[PDB]
Design a protein around this nucleic acid. Structure first.
Length: 116
DNA sequence: GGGGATTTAGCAAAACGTGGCATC
DNA sequence: CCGATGCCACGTTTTGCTAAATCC
């Protein structure tokens, strides 16, 4: 798995940025969703679902601070059906909505997950 | 007193995460 | 028999909808 799981990882980072990268779409590449999940968990100790999301939340967080792309545009661009949906997911992952997170200095790298 | 941008609400519906099992 | 796999059941979580607050 190390070899194939280590690959699905690149394909993911080579995606989130727009895809809905759901377990199914992620399934396509490789085996059955349940299996890919089995391998990847045992391989990374990280559930596929929460890792992808952790990666999208960490990436949306860096753009809110390194750029001015409107959060609706960020919502649509990372696969969210709306601002409200992203607003609640962001809030749930950071405990601070997107705009408020955008306008605060002290708020740091806290909770960021990186590429693997 | 209005208006757009943000944030929250609340419940059902769909997706996850996983262990036990049938299969390849 | 073994082990990599697909699968289903099912407790948890997240999203889909729909409105509505709050902010500025």
């Amino acid at each position: 798995d190390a070899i194939t799981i280590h690959s699905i990882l690149d394909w993911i980072e080579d995606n989130l940025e727009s895809p809905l990268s759901l377990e199914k779409v992620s399934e396509r590449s490789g085996y059955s969703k349940w299996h890919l999940q089995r391998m990847f968990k045992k391989e990374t100790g990280h559930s596929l679902g929460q890792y992808i999301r952790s990666r999208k939340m960490t990436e949306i967080a860096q753009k809110l601070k390194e750029s001015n792309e409107p959060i609706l545009y960020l919502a649509e661009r990372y696969g969210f059906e709306s601002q409200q949906t992203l607003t609640r997911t962001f809030k749930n992952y950071f405990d601070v909505p997107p705009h408020k997170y955008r306008m605060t200095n002290m708020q740091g790298e806290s909770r960021f997950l990186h590429p693997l």
